[PDB]
């Protein structure tokens, strides 16, 4: 029954994204990662909703973790260079 | 004076076994006061109120909770074992853990013996029911 | 009878001798261990010599 | 039966358990046995077995000689305890048949002190100590004896004055007055001389300087792809534990001469270790063949002892092949060819070294012996070599 | 707490703890030293 439960969680994350809350969704994405499901696009969703809350360091680490799991075309590296430009702005 | 060296020998042997007994008793009790994981537990104590005077649910709950502790403990044993060999855990805490892991299996067999007093053959599956009830605390 | 000593002097060419500093790291520790066991063994017999005659 | 500790002891407690095991062994040494001329089993053994004479350690450390050589588990304890009962009966009925109950009590208290010494061996051996058991007490008695000779308050009556024993004379003669008192300190021979202790410090420094010599064979392992380390081959190889044993057999022949002397005076000796340089030139032949006897015997007993005991190239070649070690420098299967060249010359020359120190010490005149000082400082340096690891 | 104490009362043996040995040794030493004083009655 667990794939139906985690799919319900993912659809709930989808609707919470359409509503526009950004911190709300992170509490369930970290829940989904601590549950035991590892996927490529979930890291991108977590890093995006963490970047919209403007926390740089954990977003960069989440992009790096998504690099460390699997390679993805043009999703990881654009987010990584965007967060790198953001951190270059942040440090000066 | 033939009694006197055997008097000496008798005194020394009886004082040796007396000191071994006193040392073994104090060393056992000072282990059996030390704290442990899952304190404040009361299911074994709540069973006595129903066993005083419909009770099969309490039997089910005690057996299910004990085997839930068994699953968690046979998960948790290498971690506290490595924390014993590594250097940071008390000597006495790890021994108290070593007593707890035997105590839960004694409770596991005693609850089955207490289960067969009304002779149900539920026992052969009843442990696994605990698994899905943890699902209710899961999600 | 001398070629064996020639093997000896061949052996004594490859050996990491203790240095000026290294040997004084050895002799400090061995000296304090030996002086401690010797002082213990001396004081014990000096304590026990009066007990002994008194014990009779 | 002492419970072994489940995790390894840190160093700070590992030192204190030794430092109180010694302090209980010595007090077990000097307590007078209850229920008691010049005769003995004989004088030579005491240095081999590390015991006082006439106390409740007169049985010696030889209890733990048993359960080591017996096994060479509770049945080990009971076989050592009945062998102790036999040896105690031998010592009490051969040594100093007056009465029964004193004898019955003597057997009992020798049995109990034997049990205590066998217990402290197991305590230090299981892991609370930092070394073996037999080695530590036989270092301690040698250290206590050479400090008892070097400083003591014991006086000498019946002579010309009240003479002291040791380096107490150097300060005591400051009181009596003129400049011959230094010469009177340095050369007189009825008491141990201060010239002898100024030589004792010298031989004690020289053996430490020799103890560090080694040969580093460079290893590049290949089973687990790393760990490029050394293999040390010491010059003082086989830890000179047969050599004392060698002297033991030397000492053991002496038991048969005394037996013959007390059994039959009629019949149908230079091999004793000579004591002085003055009578060394009395006979030029006998001292020369004596030092060749000691040198050749130490060399050949070490040359055997590599073969019969543990460490030999026929076994160490196998110990390199199974443990995965491979010597540097394109030595693929020439480990035997490399190692047979270097190891037995190390062993034989080390045996000759120990023998040369053995005869030069006692010719030179030293408080103790060559074998005593060497057996002490080898095991103290062993303690330092194990602890270096820290 | 009681169950843990029982665990050590139903499964025991006769081994010794490494602090007991010094107690035994000072007891035996003082037994003999004490014994000599009986001859000083």
């Amino acid at each position: 029954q667990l794939p139906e439960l985690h799919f319900m969680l993912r659809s709930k994350i989808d609707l919470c994204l359409i509503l526009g809350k950004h911190l709300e969704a992170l509490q369930d994405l970290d829940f989904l990662l601590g549950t035991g499901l590892i996927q490529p696009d979930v890291f991108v969703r977590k890093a995006d909703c963490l970047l919209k809350l403007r926390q740089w360091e954990e977003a960069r680490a989440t992009c790096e973790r998504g690099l460390a799991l699997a390679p993805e075309d043009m999703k990881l590296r654009a987010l990584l260079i965007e967060t790198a430009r953001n951190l270059a702005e942040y440090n000066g | 004076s033939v009694y006197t060296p055997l008097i000496y020998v008798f005194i020394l042997v009886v004082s040796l076994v007396m000191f071994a007994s006193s040392y073994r008793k104090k060393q056992a009790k000072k282990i059996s006061e030390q704290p442990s994981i899952f304190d404040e537990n009361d299911a074994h104590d709540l069973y006595f109120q129903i066993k005083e005077m419909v009770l099969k649910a309490a039997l089910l709950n005690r057996g299910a909770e004990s085997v839930r502790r068994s699953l968690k403990l046979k998960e948790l044993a290498p971690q506290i074992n490595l924390l014993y060999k590594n250097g940071s855990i008390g000597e006495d805490y790890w021994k108290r853990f070593e007593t707890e892991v035997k105590l839960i299996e004694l409770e596991f067999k005693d609850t089955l013996q207490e289960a067969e007093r009304l002779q149900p053959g539920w026992v052969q599956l009843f442990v696994m029911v605990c698994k899905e009830i943890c699902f209710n605390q899961a999600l | 009878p001398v070629e064996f000593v020639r093997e000896g002097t061949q052996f004594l060419a490859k050996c990491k001798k203790p240095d000026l500093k290294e040997y004084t790291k050895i002799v400090k520790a061995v000296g304090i261990g030996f002086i401690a066991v010797g002082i213990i063994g001396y004081a014990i017999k000096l304590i026990h010599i009066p007990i002994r005659y008194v014990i009779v | 039966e002492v419970i072994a500790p489940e995790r390894k002891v840190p160093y700070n407690q590992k030192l204190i358990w030794t430092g109180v095991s010694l302090l209980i062994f010595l007090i077990l040494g000097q307590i007078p046995l209850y229920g008691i001329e010049t005769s003995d089993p004989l004088y030579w053994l005491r240095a081999m077995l590390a015991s006082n004479r006439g106390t409740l350690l007169e049985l010696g450390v030889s209890p733990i000689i048993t359960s080591s050589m017996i096994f060479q588990q509770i049945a080990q304890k009971v076989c050592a305890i009945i062998l102790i009962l036999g040896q105690a009966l031998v010592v009490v009925m051969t040594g100093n048949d007056l009465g029964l109950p004193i004898c019955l009590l003597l057997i009992f208290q020798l049995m109990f002190a034997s049990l205590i010494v066998m217990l402290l061996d197991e305590l230090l051996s299981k892991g609370y100590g930092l070394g073996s058991g037999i080695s530590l007490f036989t270092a301690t008695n040698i250290a206590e004896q050479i400090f008892w000779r070097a400083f003591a308050p014991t006086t000498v009556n019946s002579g010309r004055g009240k003479e002291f024993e040791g380096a107490v004379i150097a300060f005591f003669h400051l009181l009596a007055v003129k400049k011959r008192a230094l010469v009177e300190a340095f050369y007189r021979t009825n008491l141990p001389n201060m010239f002898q202790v100024l030589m004792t410090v010298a031989i004690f420094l020289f053996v430490l300087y020799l103890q560090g010599f080694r040969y580093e064979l460079p290893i590049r392992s290949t089973k687990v792809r790393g760990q490029i380390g050394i293999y040390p081959i010491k010059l003082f190889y086989t830890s000179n534990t047969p050599i004392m044993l060698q002297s033991a057999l030397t000492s053991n022949i002496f038991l048969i001469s005394q037996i013959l002397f007390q059994k039959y005076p009629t019949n149908p000796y230079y091999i004793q270790p000579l004591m002085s340089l003055s009578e060394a030139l009395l006979d030029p032949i006998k001292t020369i063949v004596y030092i060749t006897f000691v040198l050749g015997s130490c060399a050949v007993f070490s040359k055997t002892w590599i073969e019969i005991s543990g460490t030999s190239p026929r076994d160490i070649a196998k110990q390199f092949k199974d443990q995965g070690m491979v010597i540097n420098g394109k030595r693929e299967t020439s480990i035997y060819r490399e190692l047979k060249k270097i190891i037995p010359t190390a062993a034989a020359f080390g045996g000759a070294t120990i023998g040369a120190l053995s005869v030069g010490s006692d010719l030179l005149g030293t408080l103790g012996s060559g074998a005593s000082i060497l057996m002490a400082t080898t095991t103290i340096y062993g303690y330092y070599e194990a602890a270096a690891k820290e | 707490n009681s169950i843990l104490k029982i665990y050590s009362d139903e499964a025991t043996g006769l081994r010794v703890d490494p602090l007991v040995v010094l107690f035994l040794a000072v007891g035996f030493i003082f037994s003999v030293v004490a014994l000599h004083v009986i001859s000083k009655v």
């Binding site: 829940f31 990662l33 601590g34 360091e57 790096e64 973790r65 690099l67 460390a68 799991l69 942040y90 440090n91 000066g92 | 030390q34 704290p35 994981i37 304190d39 948790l76 971690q79 506290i80 924390l83 590594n86 250097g87 940071s88 855990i89 008390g90 000597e91 006495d92 805490y93 | 304590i47 009066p50 007990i51 005659y53 008194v54 | 840190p10 407690q13 204190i16 109180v20 007090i27 400083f151 308050p153 006086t155 009556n157 107490v168 300060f171 005591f172 009181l175 392992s221 687990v224 792809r225 790393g226 760990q227 490029i228 380390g229 050394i230 | 010094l22 107690f23 000072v26 030493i29 003082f30 030293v33």
Partner: protein
Amino acid sequence: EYDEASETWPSFILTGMTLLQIYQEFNEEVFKNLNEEYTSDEIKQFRRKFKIWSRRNIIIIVGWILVAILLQRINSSPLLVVCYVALLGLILPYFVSRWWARTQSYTKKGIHNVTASNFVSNLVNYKPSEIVTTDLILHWLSFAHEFKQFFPDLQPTDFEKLLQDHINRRDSGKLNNAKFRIVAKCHSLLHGLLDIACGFRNLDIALGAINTFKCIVQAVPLTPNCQILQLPNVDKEHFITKTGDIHTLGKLFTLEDAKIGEVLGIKDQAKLNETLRVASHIPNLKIIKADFLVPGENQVTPSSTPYISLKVLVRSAKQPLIPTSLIPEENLTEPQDFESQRDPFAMMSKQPLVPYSFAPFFPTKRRGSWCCLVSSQKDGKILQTPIIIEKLSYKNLNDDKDFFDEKFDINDWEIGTIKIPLGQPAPETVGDFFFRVIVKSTDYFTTDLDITMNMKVRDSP
């Protein structure tokens, strides 16, 4: 034979080292004069409240030797039993049975054992759905036992106020020495929580226990504007009502000093001079190579003992030197010599020591260290014990250069090396592996370093 007499001529004189005692690359401290300037006297006197006896023993020994020489110059009861049984029977079996008692209460780091069991019970019921902040670990510290033996009558729910007041820079007034001993014994306890949490393969409690010591020794709360609040002259209301999104040290440094006096509200040139000085000497890092070296040979192999090597470069308030412009073959490549190939890590022992840190709001004196963790990105768990690195070179951060924000000699730029060993060996199946290594400060907020390393193993014939 029968001979006994005490008080010999020389027995006292022979036993009776003062003369021997009489016969018996650095990193500079910018802050050592400065650190006592910004402290109050309640901290200074508390330090001040917290050798020559051998010279006294030599004096008494010389006087006793002279008295014995004067005693020689005049020429030129069963009570001993009852003390011996008192000296051997009662005394000796007592202290050891105390000693083996007391050193059975501790553990390898120096924590009492009920605190260790307290942390493992505190940790075993932690759910992931709780968020770890600084207040949670400030609670779990407050449940401890070592604070109870320092002050008996206080309660654990009462200790947390005494320890919250140090973070938010309040003053209890009455209990100040108590709070001082609490924040002194914060350190050995917090590394105890770190060492328990690294056994459970738990990451967030480890990062929290590093962040809490980051917060204690500077006394600032968990704020996203924290980087400027460690600076030793600030007006909090002026920085929060200016509401300038500076939010770090580099963005504070990239603008002019008149604007610094504006945005910090500082008006004195000496105070602003000291503030810009300490804002200069705050060490950030940047990696230049992150390698998996093996001592034997060039390529990692399906059962190998690798150790990891970082080539770090300390800098602050300077523009980034390009990763090409430094010479790759000179300093970044290690020697291959056998006497430095048996044990590589002693190369790290050649380096200097870290200077004294600057913390006025902390009681004792602190040499700044650098904690470092490793972790597996396959699952996300910790992998070994944390390691504390305390030998690096701050010569790069010196006050001599001060010209980046054109001589530019490449010799002076110190490149520091960090080596971390792996207690685990390599994996078995050949293929790409990913690791994640963190290395964090312990005394300032500066810049952490959480990089990843692609352990590419191959097969070498």
